Design a protein around this ligand. Sequence first.
Ligand SMILES: [Zn+2]
Ligand SMILES: [Zn+2]
Lengths: 176, 48, 134, 196, 132, 8, 192, 114, 195
Amino acid sequence: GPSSQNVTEYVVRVPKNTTKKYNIMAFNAADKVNFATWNQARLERDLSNKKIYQEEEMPESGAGSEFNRKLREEARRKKYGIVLKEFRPEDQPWLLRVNGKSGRKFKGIKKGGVTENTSYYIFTQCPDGAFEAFPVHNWYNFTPLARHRTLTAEEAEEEWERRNKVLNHFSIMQQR
Amino acid sequence: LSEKDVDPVRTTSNDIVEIFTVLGIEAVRKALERELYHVISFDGSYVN
Amino acid sequence: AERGELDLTGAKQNTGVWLVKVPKYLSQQWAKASGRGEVGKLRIAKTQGRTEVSFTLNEDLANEHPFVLQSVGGQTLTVFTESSSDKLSLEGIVVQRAECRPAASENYMRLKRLQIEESSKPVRLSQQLDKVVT
Amino acid sequence: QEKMATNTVYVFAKKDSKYAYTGECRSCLENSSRPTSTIWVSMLARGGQGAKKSAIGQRIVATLPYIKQEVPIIIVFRALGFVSDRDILEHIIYDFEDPEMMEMVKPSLDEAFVIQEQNVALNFIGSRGAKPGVTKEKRIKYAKEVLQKEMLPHVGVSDFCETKKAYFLGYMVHRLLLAALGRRELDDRDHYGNKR
Amino acid sequence: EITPDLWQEACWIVISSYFDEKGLVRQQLDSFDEFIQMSVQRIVEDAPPIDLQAEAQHASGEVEEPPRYLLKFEQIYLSKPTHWERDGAPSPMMPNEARLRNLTYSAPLYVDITKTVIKEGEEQLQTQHQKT
Amino acid sequence: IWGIGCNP
Amino acid sequence: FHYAGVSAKNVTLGVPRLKELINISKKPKTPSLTVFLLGQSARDAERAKDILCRLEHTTLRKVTANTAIYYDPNPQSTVVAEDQEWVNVYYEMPDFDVARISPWLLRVELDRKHMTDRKLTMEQIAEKINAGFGDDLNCIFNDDNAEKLVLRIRIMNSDENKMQEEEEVVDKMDDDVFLRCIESNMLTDMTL
Amino acid sequence: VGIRFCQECNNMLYPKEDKENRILLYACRNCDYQQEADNSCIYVNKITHEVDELTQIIADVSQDPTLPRTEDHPCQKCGHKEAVFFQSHSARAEDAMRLYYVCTAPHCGHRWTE
Amino acid sequence: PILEFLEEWSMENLEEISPAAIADATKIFVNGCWVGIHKDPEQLMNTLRKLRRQMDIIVSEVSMIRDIREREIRIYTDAGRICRPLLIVEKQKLLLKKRHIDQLKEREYNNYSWQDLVASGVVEYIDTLEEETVMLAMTPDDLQEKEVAYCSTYTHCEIHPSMILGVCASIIPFPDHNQSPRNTYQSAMGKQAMG
Ligand SMILES: [Zn+2]
Ligand SMILES: [Zn+2]
């Protein structure tokens, strides 16, 4: 039939600007990602700066230095280090939470290696029958986090002190 | 030396500390002399 | 329905998309005008048990690009877009990957050397000065 | 002045050291700046005997720069963000079909099975860090900085390069495991290929 | 065009070409030339720009009122070896004169520096100092 | 330079 | 480097040996012991071979071809096809079965070349293992006629029962980990 | 023998015995998934480690200029005369000077030891 | 430049690599950094060597080493690697031919020099790491010529074996007829001579 010798040729279109930027979402094959159960999802910038960058300077900042003491306090904190960095969301990883808290959580990180000598484009079918190419603004590799009980850091330190766990570890996990 | 069919009289070890702990200080005198003579005379050299 | 919700309609429709790695000269030729709505034509010829993919450069643009396919079974890829209206959406799932390679072998190295020289222009070197500055 | 080559992985066997096989890599930031920082990946000898120690046998440890105490290797991989055991072994062992290498990796996985959180692993690295750590938040950020810059600089120093560092660290482990299995010969310090 | 049993002449002709083009001490000279031509300039460029600002001077409203001074070094220049006399008059320094008078054979090193002043006056001025 | 039993 | 092959032994000589004797080092670099045989053992090479075997340290690791830890819920089930015959023979008149049978099994194959070189006996090895670990290990040994020498080891039947009403939930090492520890200890320190 | 990783958590499965059913179960400590084990062997150690190096040899080694080549030993699979031959090249190979022949010629990739 | 070329020549980057695919492919290290893997190693290695011999993208000092047994290609552009020039052998014939030595013989008024020889592809610089992957012939005519078969795959040839000696040992006449410690002693005595 015609399938054994079909020749398909389509026009290529590259619009100058698109309202929505195009990115790449890559899942590892072993993760067995399935979209049938993806009833809902939440993709947002991370807040890990809570732990290591911001609102960590909450209490000492609002303690209440004033007057000459205020001037000195601000100047002293600034000159002590090199002005702590705050939230600049566009340069931070992405957090994905599928089906709320019940479903799996993935973390995407921008591909550090830039494509100074490469570009990536995506071809999508359209009713007009011409391929459309859109540049890849960013590449993200998402890796899942198990929805299982997580050892507390303090408890983990206590357990690690007993590095010689002669007793079965599985029972220890059950106890936690 | 205790093992059967091993001569207790002639069996000797090269380690002088073992000779001291097992056989005594006089035995070490002789054993140290023997070992030093072996290192001196291996090349054929002679020391009085 | 919320700001952080991801429009998975593309996944539900199982829209298939193709990912291609293309060189900088082609992308820069496209970016030169980038607004004419046309950069070339993609021609795919299939035989009894073999398929070939090629791209022809537009005649105006120039003033053959064979495509080599890559297996996508080792990694699952999807495309998602962040709309300017803060409405994230999924366009489709990548079903095929391809690479675009230059046709010229040796004379293409000349253009590569020119690109290398252009990239080396910002590199600054110590300059020898004949007369001591007064 | 002759020096040992930088940015290369060399596996040596030290009899006196408790580690049976030690693999070292001295990394420099493209010779542009900073002193060369050496990161050692070592395998503890099976000579040490205990009810748990004999069962685990050889256990891999890593001497990251500016951390006083040896860090189990699985913990370092989790600190870089690769929490899942399968993914860590994917970086370390390139072919899962071979059983012997997986057997070698198993004890170190068991040693680090307490820590399954990236943040907890970072906190542990900071706590055993030589520089003092006042709080958990400070320790985590400090250890993250050490991993970003001090360890394996030639692979990357910024730009979210954790995957590249994970792959190169796994290469160091892979080479250490191959030396322990005997599949690759231990490197020679006197070879003038190594002596820049 | 093979060279059979004429190889003794041929090998020493190619060895002679090697030693004519590349001297015996070529390694030292080439390394030093790399240092001066590329490494010095790269070290200058790699250094982070100097950022300076006043410590809340004048205790006023201080809405970024202290000026910000930014310095960036660029375009390093080297002169030929030169000896300045007691009079202060520059003059070229020949190597033998350096041996006899116990002088040091050195060359002046000049850098272009750009200084930008940001006083939050809605105007930034980027003065350039040439061959410092 | 002679043999294994001699000298180097 | 320039000793001779006549010695047929590593020997420290020269300046290093002079330093060892002079400093009376506790550990010589090459400790050695020359044994002179008393009587007929000196005359006959075979008797001297017997004495050699008596004097040279031999562990299970030297004579063991390979070790495998299996889980066999029923000894009669004989998960390994090969051990079916001799396990059935032993359990025709089972011993210590009344206490219990531990499900985890340690199967050790002993190289015949090494076994005959050191003139060890399967019954002898079984007795030594039984004495070293008391009744905590139950061993089954093949006949020498069998082409493959197999020793089957299981945890103590009394220990498997625990012989205790309380039974203690400590469950130290369960049984598989304990069996691995036993294997390592046997290989390293059997001193057959 | 081989190590199995659980699907639910992608972590190593450790052996475990169900007392009620006397059935071996590979169960992760982190997650509750349990799997019946078909192999029924937990740990295998080969002290002799008599493992053939024919599997380890790569067919790519035939391209090496430095390797000696013999036309005396013909290839068994395809009859190509040339064959690079090299020794064990392996630490912990005990004492073996066996030559592990590798057939030359493109794509044969045959490794035999005589 | 080498990294750009490698990207052009079908080298998959580590970031884009599926972890399973690494096992069957050679790893490409550039200056000690694992850039990526290549599915077909020999073609890439030949292309890199052609480029270096033509001095197009890869400079002469850059050394490419392929460890066939370990499936790794290492390219070093680092400084401080010690290299010696060696003649190149293709098939069993030296690439250096009578036309080249005729041009070199009239080195004056022909402006043909060692750089022309390097650019022509007759000679190449090889460091020790690359020496491990190279079959060398001490003397061209003797070893290249067909005899009782020892090696039929010589890839490089020594220019002259007497170039292994240094400056002070090169003044010794008939060095091969002396005991070695005596050549070592003359190397030290010649530094203290008067002239
Ligand atoms: Zn699981
Ligand atoms: Zn064949």
